[PDB]
Amino acid sequence: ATVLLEVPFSARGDRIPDAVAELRTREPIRKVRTITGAEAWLVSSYALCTQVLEDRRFSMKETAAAGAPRLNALTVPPEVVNNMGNIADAGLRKAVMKAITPKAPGLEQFLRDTANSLLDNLITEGAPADLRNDFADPLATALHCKVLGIPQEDGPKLFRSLSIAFMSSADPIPAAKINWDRDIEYMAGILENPNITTGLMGELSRLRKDPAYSHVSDELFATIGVTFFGAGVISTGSFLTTALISLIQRPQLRNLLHEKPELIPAGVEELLRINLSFADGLPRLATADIQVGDVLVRKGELVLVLLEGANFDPEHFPNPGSIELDRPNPTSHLAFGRGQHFCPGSALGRRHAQIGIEALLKKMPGVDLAVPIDQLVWRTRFQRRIPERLPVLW
Ligand code: HEM
Ligand SMILES: Cc1cc(C[C@@H]2NC(=O)[C@H](Cc3ccc(O)cc3)NC2=O)ccc1O
Fold first, then answer.
1. CATH of the domain at 265
2. How many helices (H) and strands (E) does the chain have?
């Protein structure tokens, strides 16, 4: 007697389990059990992942409904699962998306300056260096303080909420509410602070006092700050960290991008495609009976969209484990999702990684792991896959 297949399969972010390819071939939608004990449908082919993400009857909002089968416990108030919907309904979607592009004057230069300063400090201190805690995550934090218009010195405290906020837990987490309420209070004070005039929070502060927004709640304005800081920092920091591993393990690619930095955008797009930073499939709740492959998913059931199932599918990306800079379909991966909930920070996330890699390859052309790859410690029961430390020499 066996048990129902459990998800997630592995917290290791340096390699995909051989098991994913076997599953995609044999059963590209199949029943699994999540850490809560709920049953769910795990979808692992490119075609069926795209189908689910482009059909809004598979709803992200309804995953928050009381009594639903759950992937994990909520770490935000349930109305925040509808965050982008709430922003759109408030008439704020265009302004929010405009504030988080990489295109504001001076933003790219600030990113380069910050990355170079972090790297110079590591070089001064001498190898080994930890590229997660002392490069990728501080670069992500600095970027999001600048994008939000808030003081750089406020970044570390906001950052330290995230090791709990993005937990993937069977049960509610008391610390998550403590930190959430504190971080909301912080952002509410930012909106009242006359010195905050730039970035996303400076723009929201003006719109809040504009008559066209007089009935938008103060709670939503503060929530936009907390959520875009948290999603952006955890996503860019975790992605850059595991991209650095993929790059360091490919010395030929490392040297090519060092020699020809104009290929860095194509390289980052492939690093996005093969990235294992998302620890769980993306969750959706069926709001109707819907045919997905050989399975009739029933109303009220949970569906999990496995991004690396799609992104390593050889029917869409031949030789899927190979980084190839000349693919005919290079941005067609699902690293930023697809459909209604496509990542609103995709351009900024690309530029964060491109600039971080450019700066690293120039400052540390001989970068290499300082420990055997199996010695990395992979964070468990978390919404991202990340090594607790990333020790390198150069
Ligand atoms: C490389 C970096 C990033 C990656 C890999 C990434 C990935 C994703 C993915 C896969 C989704 C879809 C989730 C779903 O459909 O369930 C998403 C949504 C989102 N991302 Fe990103 N993201 C990144 C950077 C950022 C940045 C920089 C921000 C903000 C500054 C951000 C904010 C968000 C938000 C707010 C959503 C939810 C959108 C919605 O529900 O409609 N992300 N991201
Ligand atoms: C835990 C946490 C999540 C967020 C993002 C915020 N929460 C949501 O549930 C929905 C959907 C979602 C999107 C991306 C993601 O990675 C997880 C969920 N949309 C949002 O914008 C922000 C701060 C947090 O502490």
1. 1.10.630.10
2. 15, 10
Residue 330, classified by CB atoms within 10 Å of its CB into exposed (0-12), middle (13-18) or buried (19+), is middle
**Structural domain of 362:** 1-394
Q: How many domains does the chain have?
A: 1
- Declared resolution, Å: 1.6
**CA 30 to ligand 1 centroid distance, Å:** 26
Let me know: does 138 contact 189? Beta carbons within 8 Å: no
C-alpha span between 296 and 290 (Å, rounded): 6
b/e per residue, 355-371, with b = 16+ CB within 10 A? bbbbbbbebbeebebbe
CA 320 to chain CA mean position, Å = 21
Q: List residues bridging with 278 in a β-sheet.
A: 384
Q: For residue 348, which of 187, 92, 86, 107 has the smallest C-alpha distance?
A: 107
3, two tokens = 């048990």
User: Measured between alpha carbons, how far is 94 from 55 in angstroms, rounded to an integer?
Assistant: 23
**Any bridge partners for residue 32, and if so which?**
40
User: Cα–Cα distance between 141 and 143 in angstroms, integer?
Assistant: 5
Q: Which amino acid is at 284?
A: R
Q: Is the CB of 277 under 6 A from ligand 2?
A: no
CA 283 to ligand 1: nearest atom: 16
Distance from the CA of 95 to the center of ligand 1, in angstroms?
17
Atom of ligand 2 nearest to the CA of 383: 16
41 contacts 290 by C-beta, under 8 angstroms: no
Q: In what order do the strands lie in the sheet with 29-33?
A: 29-33, 39-43, 302-305, 282-286, 58-59
Q: How far apart are CA 216 and CA 207, in angstroms?
A: 10
